[PDB]
């Protein structure tokens, strides 16, 4: 249900979709192809759902990290530009959009989070994070808040968590180690501890999301925010006298923003592949094409050599890139979505008080690694019916903590009924039955109707 002879593009909401729409109009009456730009919610999870059944957009615009995941599902068509086109862009930005050696998207621009401050409210910005509590109770007197940023997305809070010692996956021998997740070490705790300290002291609202912190800075109510290059145009509309600068440093260590490369991937199920190609290559990735989007919302540092020479002299890009230099580029492995979600959970729970940091982070460790919880790791080993020819249900646990050992498919598995003297678990003469199904998955339901 995604038609031919027309281009439908999906970009994030905060990006320059209007500038991209202007590039669409230029392309519309140059060939004769209808180009329309949409910006839907949860776009980065919508796409792998709609496109997975042949029906996504033609082009999708996201940070390079999500693309690795999509690539694996084969939602993205592999793009082959002649080596002569690849010269227009910086050679290293092509690596960002590489998965299994296949080039999967076109690198557009580099964005990293920067500390934006109000030159008027705060003349000299804070070098460290520890001085913010001190420099808030000062501003709170004069009816203002010191620091406000989106606490709802991990992309924003992670630079702080990462500052001391935290990281996603350890880069070992030209690769990423997926069992090794440092989302919960000493440095990661110190980061999230101090972040909660700001909430459980009324320095920052744990409610605060994007448009809230966005509107407040533009009204002139908050001293500092943390945002990306896209944010700059609304701060211009409001005509605040502002400065983009390096993020504060926590425990002497610099803050480590994860750095994204905005990329454009072509939908595999799309029939308009070459049509899209000529749009991106010939129209979008060019001086005017990138100027249009940058006119709408600033892109950060672009990947296009020619245009970047110009953007380079902008003092705001200088600070953006100086921040990116302290941080790391995102991995584009599929385990990233797990990591991101693993942290969203943790930061949310810690913020609301739902969990103490150590608890929230231990869960985050489990989630990002995608392993069993401490409680359940002992099910892993179990497979009391094994050395298996054919399909299997892998050792799993159910919602009571009953291990279901690895079994060949199409077989009724039996395990003793749990019972509980208060917390204390024990086994009865009775049996819980569960079928390891013919297709290799455990039956959703465990028949526990005999343990009375």
């Amino acid at each position: 249900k995604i038609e031919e002879g027309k281009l439908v593009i999906w970009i994030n909401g905060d990006k320059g979709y209007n500038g991209l729409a202007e590039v669409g109009k230029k392309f519309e009456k140059d060939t004769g192809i209808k180009v329309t730009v949409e910006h839907p919610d949860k776009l980065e999870e919508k796409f792998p759902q709609v496109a997975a059944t042949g029906d996504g957009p033609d082009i999708i615009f996201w940070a390079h990290d999500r693309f690795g995941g999509y690539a694996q599902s084969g939602l993205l068509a592999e793009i082959t530009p002649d080596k002569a086109f690849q010269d227009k862009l910086y050679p290293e930005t092509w690596d960002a959009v590489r998965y299994n050696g296949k080039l999967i998207a076109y690198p557009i621009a580099v964005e990293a989070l920067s500390l934006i401050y109000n030159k008027d409210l705060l003349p000299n910005p804070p070098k460290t994070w520890e001085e913010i509590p001190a420099l808030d109770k000062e501003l709170k007197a004069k009816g203002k808040s010191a620091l406000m940023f989106n606490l709802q997305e991990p992309y924003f809070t992670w630079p702080l968590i990462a500052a001391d010692g935290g990281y996603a996956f350890k880069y070992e021998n030209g690769k990423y180690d997926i069992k090794d997740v440092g989302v919960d070490n000493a440095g990661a705790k110190a980061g999230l501890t101090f972040l909660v300290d700001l909430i459980k002291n009324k320095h920052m609202n744990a409610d605060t999301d994007y448009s809230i912190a966005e509107a407040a800075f533009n009204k002139g109510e908050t001293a500092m925010t943390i945002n990306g290059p896209w944010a700059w145009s609304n701060i211009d509309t409001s005509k605040v006298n502002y400065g983009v600068t390096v993020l504060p440093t926590f425990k002497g260590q610099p803050s480590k923003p994860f750095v994204g490369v905005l990329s454009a991937g072509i939908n595999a199920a799309s029939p308009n592949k070459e049509l899209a190609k000529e749009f991106l290559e010939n129209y979008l990735l060019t001086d005017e094409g990138l100027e249009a989007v940058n006119k709408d919302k600033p892109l950060g540092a672009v990947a296009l050599k020619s245009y970047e020479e110009e953007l380079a002299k902008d003092p705001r890009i200088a600070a953006t890139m100086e921040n990116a230099q302290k941080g790391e580029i995102m991995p584009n492995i599929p385990q990233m979505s797990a990591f991101w979600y693993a942290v969203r959970t943790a930061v949310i729970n810690a913020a609301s008080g739902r969990q103490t940091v150590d608890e929230a982070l231990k869960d985050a460790q489990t989630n990002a690694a995608a392993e069993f919880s401490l409680q359940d790791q002992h099910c892993e080993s179990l497979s009391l019916a094994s050395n298996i020819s054919g399909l299997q249900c892998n050792a799993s646990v159910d919602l009571i903590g009953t291990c279901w050992p690895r079994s060949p498919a199409g077989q009724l598995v039996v395990r003793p009924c749990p019972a509980f003297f208060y917390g204390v678990r024990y086994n009865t003469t009775n049996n819980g039955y569960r079928e390891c199904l013919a297709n290799g998955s455990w039956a959703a339901r465990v028949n526990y109707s005999e343990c009375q």
Binding site: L399, I400, F420, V446, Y448
Partner: peptide, 11 residues
């Protein structure tokens, strides 16, 4: 126990 019979009926 009780909040665990309730669980086991659903589970």
């Amino acid at each position: 126990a009780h909040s665990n019979r309730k669980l086991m009926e659903i589970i």
